[PDB]
């Protein structure tokens, strides 16, 4: 029971190896029988070899008999059964072969007895048609010959030692005992020579009998295992295996059609590089198969791509010859891979390759920094140039993430490119180009944001991140050093780049990652205030919405009341908003009157000031300066006149909404009054009238903004306002208007559910520019999402959302996610009414079909097929999933039956029902999901039918037949 002893938890593998050695010394036949029985029961054959049947009759008929006597209960074999107990079985099996053959290498392995039978049986079973026998025999003989390779290595070392001692004696001819030692060494050398010849004989026998047959085998895993292990051997025994005689098989196997075999080929090739260099035949094969290696860089499997990139890195360690510049740019594009390990491997290769200004990839004192503020400048320089040439990305986020861990020491040396950006270093280089300036600033944005937060961006995200102590302490002192460095650098950074809008927008994302109590410890609030005045100059010099958003977000980050500086920053915030209030009042009180003219200058001043006010009012409570009077006067004169720019109205509407929501903030504070409550409700009602007028206004972005503002107003006054333990907010609650609901539905249908260019309510996007179709599609998805969010929270009538549910196939790619989620949520809110509106959606589509085609309805057309497919996916959306499972199905069936006989035919004939093809739609909802309620639904169905309708069975009433 050596199979069971090795399998079922062997305490010491060398112990049973020595037991087999002792039994072999006792009697060769019984130990050979035990080893053969072990191998056969390792093959999955439950037959047991006996003494006479092993001794007398040959191995091929043994193989035939055990094929007949396999005695299976399943097709599985011990190399593929689930895991644990069998995994450690396989490991024990391999270790038993290795230790058993390697331990006998001194005296037992030259008896010329066991290996003949073992080789014959294993070769025959590797030529056997049974996959189990082939796999098990290949593994057994494969570990056998691996052990024989180790024995050959030991014999070669012994030959080297005895040759050295023979030459050492041949130096010294003095001594008769020395001559006797020389003759003993010669006899030992001859014994080792004949032992080596025998080992070579069994080596060649096993090789030409097994490996040549089984690397052409139809099983991928046998070839993969063979190639991986042959690379292991050629890594460890390069004396005889490092030649083309074994590399021809590797070259032939590199073109395998299976990913795992090629993975093992790349592992073998890396084993030729790891960890020793250099060999000429290795570089010859590298230059021979550079094209195949770069082919595997773009393989389907991510693992094969990673191994190919690592082999390329190994070649760069060893050769620097075979790789071409186009291959280099291919890997530079692989830096932008979606899969993070591939990108990180490519970035590590890039760091190894293109960074040799003063680092020779060698020892220090000239490699990291030469004690000056200059050596690392050129590394920064081809970072900038690489970002310039990499036109596959406007941002170096993926590039920096790939180059993060490989260049950790280089990416924290922010002071170096800081002097190479602002203060004109002593290197005598050219002027820092504006495109290069923006590229370097984008690189800094990426590097410091990855310095603060360590999570990779979206697509590279994992969510299974754990922070070690080293990680968190590196994060903290990294935060400290960036804080103290950049509170110094940002003042003259802004002073150099005040007028550059995009550079300011990029630079003001870092202060989200600044520990503000360090200012209290560092006493650098004065530099904070200098940067506040500098960004005040930017704000008063820039009118861009994006930079105002960035500034407002930066202020909100530094408006952290948990830090002492909140008063000091609130000084500057109040000062700047007070300036903007004064400027807004001065400009508005002259713009609202007609006068002369109003010209473009006053329009520009009003628009810029209101942009700034709206932007800084989004993130900050500024209702102490009640400018809703000016904004509402501007909105009402926009209503009355209508001849003035769009953006001013957009800014006024958004600023008024911001004021309203900031007032809404300070009523849930536990102190609600009533006079200001009614005042706020009246202002909200006026804002609702203005928003309805703007929705009726001809301008379509104004229509969308009015729609989303109305969405915000309705969710503010939604039914879930009463959830959070509120009592006095009940007067504030305002119900939707049915005409307003119809206007909203009409707007949504005219401006959302469009997938063609015929409507012309969606901007073109044909040219692959910043004005692509994707922006319009995502904006329409956002508007539909806001509308559905109003729908699902008991605010607006969801019979209007039935018309949204009906568009699930015409807009599957565009809005199928939104329609499916809305249907699921409305099912979770009220499944009965959800099913009623679902069958209403089907009725609406069917009535559109009635309008388009008439009462014949074209029952075999694509429209009916699409409606029936929609019915199928709706029926599988139901079932036993929520409460009132079949009651909703019964209600849907009753509604469908009512609709199928809703209209009666005037001519030809009275009993044929119009809208009969809806029974085909309902037949998908009947199917076989239910069984007991089918009788009740049929009883409801037969109320509208007659016996004359029962008896007729033709093409017109085929929907009725299919439903019944």
């Amino acid at each position: 029971t050596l199979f069971e002893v090795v399998k079922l938890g062997k305490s010491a593998m060398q112990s049973v190896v020595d037991d087999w050695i002792e039994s072999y010394k006792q009697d060769r036949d019984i130990a050979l029988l035990d080893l053969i029985n072990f191998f056969i029961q390792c093959s999955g054959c439950r037959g047991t070899v006996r003494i006479e049947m092993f001794r007398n009759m040959q191995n091929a008929e043994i193989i035939r008999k055990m094929t007949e006597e396999f005695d299976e209960d399943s097709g599985d074999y011990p190399l593929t059964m689930p895991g644990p107990q069998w995994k450690k079985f396989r490991s024990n099996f391999c270790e038993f072969i290795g230790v058993l053959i390697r331990q006998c290498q001194y005296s037992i392995i030259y008896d010329e007895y066991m290996m003949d039978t073992v080789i014959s049986l294993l070769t025959g079973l590797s030529d056997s048609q049974v996959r189990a026998f082939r796999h098990t025999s290949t593994l057994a003989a494969m570990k056998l010959m691996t052990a024989l390779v180790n024995v050959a290595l030991n014999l070669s070392i012994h030959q080297d030692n005895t040759q050295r001692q023979y030459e050492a004696e041949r130096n010294k001819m003095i001594g008769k005992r020395a001559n006797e030692r020389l003759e003993l060494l010669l006899q030992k050398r001859k014994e080792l020579q004949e032992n080596q010849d025998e080992i070579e004989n069994m080596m060649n026998s096993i090789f030409k009998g097994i490996f040549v047959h089984r690397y052409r085998d139809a099983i991928a895993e046998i070839r993969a295992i063979c190639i991986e292990e042959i690379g292991v051997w050629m890594k460890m025994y390069s004396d005889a295996f490092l030649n083309d005689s074994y590399l021809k098989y590797v070259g032939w196997t590199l073109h395998d059609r299976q990913g795992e075999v090629r993975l093992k080929c790349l592992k073998a090739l890396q084993s030729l590089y790891t960890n020793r260099e250099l060999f000429p035949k290795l570089e010859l094969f590298t230059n021979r198969f550079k094209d195949r290696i770069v082919s595997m860089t773009l393989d389907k499997e991510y693992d094969v791509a990673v191994e190919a990139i690592r082999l390329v890195t190994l070649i760069l360690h060893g050769s620097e010859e075979a790789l071409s510049n186009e291959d280099c740019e291919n890997v530079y594009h692989l830096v932008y891979s979606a899969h993070r390990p591939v990108a990180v491997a490519a970035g590590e290769f890039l760091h190894k390759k293109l960074f040799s200004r003063h680092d020779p990839q060698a020892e220090e004192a000239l490699a990291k920094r030469r004690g000056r503020n200059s050596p690392n400048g050129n590394l920064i320089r081809m970072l900038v140039l690489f970002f310039l040439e990499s036109e596959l990305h406007e941002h170096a986020a993926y590039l920096v993430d790939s180059l993060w861990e490989s260049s950790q020491e280089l990416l924290k040396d922010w002071e170096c490119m800081t002097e190479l950006l602002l203060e004109e270093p002593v290197q005598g280089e050219e002027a820092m180009s504006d495109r290069q300036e923006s590229a370097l600033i984008e690189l800094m944005v990426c590097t410091i944001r990855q310095a603060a937060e360590a999570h990779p961006p979206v697509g590279r995200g994992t969510g299974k991140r754990v922070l070690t102590a080293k990680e968190r302490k590196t994060q903290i002192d990294d935060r400290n050093k960036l804080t103290e460095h950049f509170i110094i650098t940002l003042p003259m950074l802004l002073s150099k780049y005040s007028a550059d809008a995009e550079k300011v927008a990029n630079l003001l994302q870092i202060p989200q990652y600044f520990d503000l109590e360090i200012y209290s410890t560092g006493r650098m609030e004065k530099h904070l205030d200098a940067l506040l005045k500098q960004i005040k100059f930017v704000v008063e010099k820039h009118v861009e919405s994006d930079v105002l958003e960035a500034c407002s977000k930066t202020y909100s980050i530094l408006c952290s009341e948990e830090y002492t500086i909140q008063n000091r920053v609130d000084i500057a915030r109040s000062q700047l908003i007070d300036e903007f209030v004064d400027r807004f009042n001065h400009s508005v009180e002259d713009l609202l009157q007609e006068g002369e003219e109003a010209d473009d200058d006053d329009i520009y001043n009003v628009l810029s000031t209101l942009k700034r006010l709206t932007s800084f009012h989004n993130a900050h409570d500024l209702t102490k300066w009640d400018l809703f009077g000016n904004c509402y006067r501007l909105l009402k004169t926009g209503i009355e006149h209508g001849a003035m720019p769009e953006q001013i109205v957009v800014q006024a509407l958004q600023c008024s909404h911001y004021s309203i929501l900031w007032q809404l903030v300070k009523i849930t504070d536990g102190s609600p009054s009533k006079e200001d409550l009614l005042v706020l409700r009246k202002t909200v009602k006026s804002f609702l009238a203005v928003c309805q007028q703007c929705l009726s206004n001809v301008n379509t972005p104004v229509k969308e903004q009015a729609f989303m503002l109305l969405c915000d107003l309705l969710m503010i006054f939604s039914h879930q306002l009463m959830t959070g333990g509120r009592e006095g907010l009940q007067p504030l609650v305002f119900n939707p208007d049915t005409g307003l609901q119809s206007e909203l539905l009409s707007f949504v249908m005219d401006h959302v559910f469009i997938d063609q260019d015929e409507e012309n309510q969606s901007m073109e996007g044909d040219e692959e520019d910043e004005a692509n179709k994707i922006e319009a599609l995502h904006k329409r998805r956002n508007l539909l999402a806001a509308f559905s969010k109003l729908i699902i929270y008991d605010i607006v009538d969801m019979h209007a959302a039935a018309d949204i549910f009906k568009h699930y196939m015409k807009y599957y790619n565009d809005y199928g996610d939104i329609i499916k989620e809305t249907l699921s949520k409305t099912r979770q809110i009220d499944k009965i009414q959800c099913a009623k509106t679902l069958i209403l959606s089907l009725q609406q589509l069917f009535n559109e079909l009635v309008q388009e085609q008439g009462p014949n309805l074209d029952r075999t057309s694509a429209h009916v097929s699409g409606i029936k497919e929609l019915a199928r996916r709706f029926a599988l959306t139901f079932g036993l999933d929520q409460i009132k499972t079949r009651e909703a199905v019964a209600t849907l069936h009753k509604d469908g039956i009512e609709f199928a006989f809703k209209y009666q035919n005037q001519k030809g004939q009275e009993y044929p029902p119009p809208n009969l093809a809806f029974l085909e739609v309902l037949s998908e909802f009947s199917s076989k999901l239910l069984r007991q309620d089918k009788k009740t639904v049929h009883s409801y169905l037969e109320k509208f039918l007659t016996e004359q309708m029962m008896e007729r069975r033709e093409d017109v009433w085929l929907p009725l037949i299919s439903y019944r």
């Binding site: 094929t67 396999f70 097709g75 030529d127 048609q129 996959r131 082939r134 047959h213 052409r216 085998d217 139809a218 032939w252 073109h255 395998d256 059609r257 082919s295 773009l298 393989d299 389907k300 594009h333 692989l334 932008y336 891979s337 979606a338 899969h339 990108a343 596959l392 990305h393 406007e394 941002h395 961006p457 697509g459 407002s552 977000k553 909100s556 989004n618 993130a619 809404l664 903030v665 989303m708 969405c711 915000d712 969710m715 503010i716 939604s718 879930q720 306002l721 959830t723 994707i774 995502h778 998805r781 508007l783 999402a785 559905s788 969010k789 929270y793 996610d817 939104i818 499916k820 989620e821």
Partner: protein, 248 residues
């Protein structure tokens, strides 16, 4: 180790692990003495050790209270009025200690591919090749992708809400040899019956050692008051006659 009396065990026996925290307030002395007064199975020496513990801790409270009074003394007294070869051995002579010494089994009709498939693999291998999964070039592609999804988009406002407080408002809407000699004399008397036993007669045919043993035997029998021995002149044979405890 464990117990309300464990601290007293430490005080009695270890006394080093005690700290000021236990000394000040851990137990009331008057409480623990009345705890220990009526206890059953109390061995004498363990009671002595518990007395050690209580005496030690009581005196330690007295020392610490004395201390407390001392820093009280310091705090009450304050007030504020604005108004070469020197030392060695003679050589190393003092220091010179010296050193000393149908079938369902798997049957494969073909097990090896022909050379035609091998040559086709060598000539063409473009059927198992892809190109790349390019990352999106622009930042707006990220802020649409990570907002891409109805599980997120239905739980976030259409407009970005830069204040988390506004996000709270949004989510608010989410739901024995002496006897031998005696008997030997009993038969020795009955042979003659002359009530006079001769010492020399018994040792007529014996050596010195057994004669001395017999003499000491007569001595010890006289000691047990069982027999009366008479001898008058300084040197004669001893006459033994039955005494009170002769046992006949």
């Amino acid at each position: 180790k464990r117990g309300p009396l464990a601290k007293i065990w430490l005080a009695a026996h270890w006394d080093k692990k005690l700290t000021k925290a236990h000394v000040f307030e851990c137990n009331l002395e008057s409480s623990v003495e009345s705890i220990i007064s009526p206890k059953v199975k109390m061995a004498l020496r363990t009671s002595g050790h518990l007395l050690l513990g209580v005496v030690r801790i009581y005196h330690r409270k007295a020392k610490y209270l004395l201390a407390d009074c001392n820093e009280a003394f310091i705090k009450i007294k304050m007030a504020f009025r604005p108004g070469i070869l020197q030392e060695n051995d003679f050589g190393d002579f003092g220091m010179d200690d010296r050193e000393i010494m149908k079938r369902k089994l798997i049957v494969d009709s073909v097990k090896e591919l022909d050379s035609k498939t091998i040559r086709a693999q060598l000539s063409d291998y473009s059927d198992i090749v892809t190109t790349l999964d390019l990352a999106p070039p622009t930042k707006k592609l990220m802020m649409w992708k990570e907002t891409g999804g109805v599980e997120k988009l239905f739980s976030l406002p259409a407009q970005p809400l830069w204040n988390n407080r506004l996000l709270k408002l949004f989510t608010r809407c989410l739901t024995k040899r002496t006897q031998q000699m005696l008997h030997g004399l009993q038969r020795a008397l009955a042979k003659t019956g002359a009530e006079s036993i001769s010492l020399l007669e018994l040792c007529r045919n014996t050596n010195r050692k057994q004669a001395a043993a017999k003499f000491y035997s007569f001595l010890v029998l006289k000691k047990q008051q069982a027999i009366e021995l008479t001898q008058e002149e300084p040197y004669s044979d001893i006459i033994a006659t039955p005494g009170p405890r002769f046992h006949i």
